[PDB]
Design an enzyme around this catalytic site. Structure first.
Site, PDB file in Angstrom:
ATOM      1  N   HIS A  41      38.141  47.385  40.633  1.00 38.59           N
ATOM      2  CA  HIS A  41      38.878  46.538  39.697  1.00 38.59           C
ATOM      3  C   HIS A  41      39.933  45.679  40.404  1.00 38.59           C
ATOM      4  O   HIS A  41      40.646  44.949  39.704  1.00 38.59           O
ATOM      5  CB  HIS A  41      39.354  47.322  38.503  1.00 38.59           C
ATOM      6  CG  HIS A  41      38.187  48.031  37.827  1.00 38.59           C
ATOM      7  ND1 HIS A  41      37.037  47.364  37.322  1.00 38.59           N
ATOM      8  CD2 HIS A  41      37.864  49.345  37.865  1.00 38.59           C
ATOM      9  CE1 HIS A  41      36.169  48.315  36.947  1.00 38.59           C
ATOM     10  NE2 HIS A  41      36.670  49.516  37.216  1.00 38.59           N
ATOM     11  N   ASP A  89      34.594  53.500  41.080  1.00 33.29           N
ATOM     12  CA  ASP A  89      35.641  52.553  41.334  1.00 33.29           C
ATOM     13  C   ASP A  89      35.689  52.118  42.781  1.00 33.29           C
ATOM     14  O   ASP A  89      36.722  52.265  43.478  1.00 33.29           O
ATOM     15  CB  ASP A  89      36.950  53.076  40.807  1.00 33.29           C
ATOM     16  CG  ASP A  89      38.065  52.060  40.729  1.00 33.29           C
ATOM     17  OD1 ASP A  89      37.858  50.836  40.923  1.00 33.29           O
ATOM     18  OD2 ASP A  89      39.203  52.517  40.373  1.00 33.29           O
ATOM     19  N   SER A 183      46.016  50.843  45.378  1.00 30.82           N
ATOM     20  CA  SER A 183      44.602  50.830  44.918  1.00 30.82           C
ATOM     21  C   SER A 183      43.734  50.263  45.985  1.00 30.82           C
ATOM     22  O   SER A 183      44.025  49.178  46.522  1.00 30.82           O
ATOM     23  CB  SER A 183      44.557  49.961  43.661  1.00 30.82           C
ATOM     24  OG  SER A 183      45.265  48.745  43.812  1.00 30.82           O
ATOM     25  N   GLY A 184      42.589  50.910  46.206  1.00 30.73           N
ATOM     26  CA  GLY A 184      41.616  50.387  47.180  1.00 30.73           C
ATOM     27  C   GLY A 184      41.806  50.878  48.562  1.00 30.73           C
ATOM     28  O   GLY A 184      40.951  50.766  49.425  1.00 30.73           O
TER      29      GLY A 184
END
Ligand SMILES: NC(=O)n1cc(NC(=O)N2[C@@H]3C[C@@H]3C[C@H]2C(=O)Nc2cccc(OC(F)(F)F)c2)c2ccccc21
Length: 228
Positions: A41, A89, A183-184
């Site tokens: 995302h 994800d 994130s990531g």
């Protein structure tokens, strides 16, 4: 990263900053010469903008000899990911050319054996995400060492209440934690990539609400297929 410290410069040569119009958006991890892994995302709000990957960096703003900003040929979110779920994800970014490798830019080996780590295993997560409740943004890479939290505890009603599938893992979140903008990025255990910080907004640094990371081993076939 909440509750962490400034990382040693270039000591994590796999670490990537995934950027939108030259601004840090997500962490990522160099997993092959031309591919960076991140979170699905990360590019949710991107289509009107330029996606790039900064490798070889410590500071986001200062010149460093190993720093290079790569363009992206293709972004490949996991085909099963959906906005508003935590599943699947993952995101793969193909750089416009192979990364120039050296002491400050190198791919991280990543876990293919699909079994859990021991509880308590101490793993490293790094990022340029926020570092306090006011949302302060660090210029330079931060990190924290976090023990893995067993899935049963992570699934209890008071914690994540059944949402932690076998494809996810948790780490403790007691003050020390991933947060917005991490994130990531990578969760590294034993010098191998184990997890990728999830995209979903979630509260930061509350011991009752552990960090959530996608298990890369659970997606080995997908990663291999895209990489090839
Ligand atoms: N796992 C974990 O705890 N979390 C993960 C979060 N997800 C994000 O963070 N984003 C999702 C992936 C998109 C883009 C990205 C983002 O907003 N990136 C972003 C946006 C604006 C500025 C920015 O830079 C910086 F420095 F502030 F981080 C990053 C998050 C947010 C709030 C709380 C917890 C959070």
């Amino acid at each position: 990263i909440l509750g962490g410290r400034e990382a040693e410069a270039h000591a994590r040569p796999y670490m990537a900053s995934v950027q939108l119009n030259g601004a840090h958006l997500c962490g990522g991890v160099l997993v092959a010469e031309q591919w960076v892994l991140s979170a699905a995302h990360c590019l949710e709000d991107a289509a009107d903008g330029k996606v790039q990957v900064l490798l070889g960096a410590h500071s986001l703003s200062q010149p460093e000899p190993s720093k290079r900003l790569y363009d992206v040929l293709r972004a490949v979110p996991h085909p099963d990911s959906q906005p508003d779920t935590i599943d699947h994800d993952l995101l793969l970014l193909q750089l416009s050319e192979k990364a120039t490798l050296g002491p400050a830019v190198r791919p991280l080996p990543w876990q293919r054996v699909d079994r859990d780590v021991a509880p308590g295993t101490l793993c490293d997560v790094a990022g340029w995400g926020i570092v306090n409740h006011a949302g302060r943004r660090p210029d330079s890479l931060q990190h924290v060492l976090l023990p893995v939290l067993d899935r049963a505890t992570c699934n209890r009603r008071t914690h994540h209440d059944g949402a932690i599938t076998e494809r996810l893992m948790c780490a403790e979140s007691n003050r020390r934690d991933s947060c917005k903008g991490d994130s990531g990025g990578p969760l590294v255990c034993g010098g191998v990539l184990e997890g990728v910080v999830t995209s979903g907004s979630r509260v930061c640094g509350n011991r009752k609400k552990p960090g959530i990371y996608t298990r890369v081993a659970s997606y080995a076939a997908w990663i291999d297929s895209v990489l090839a």
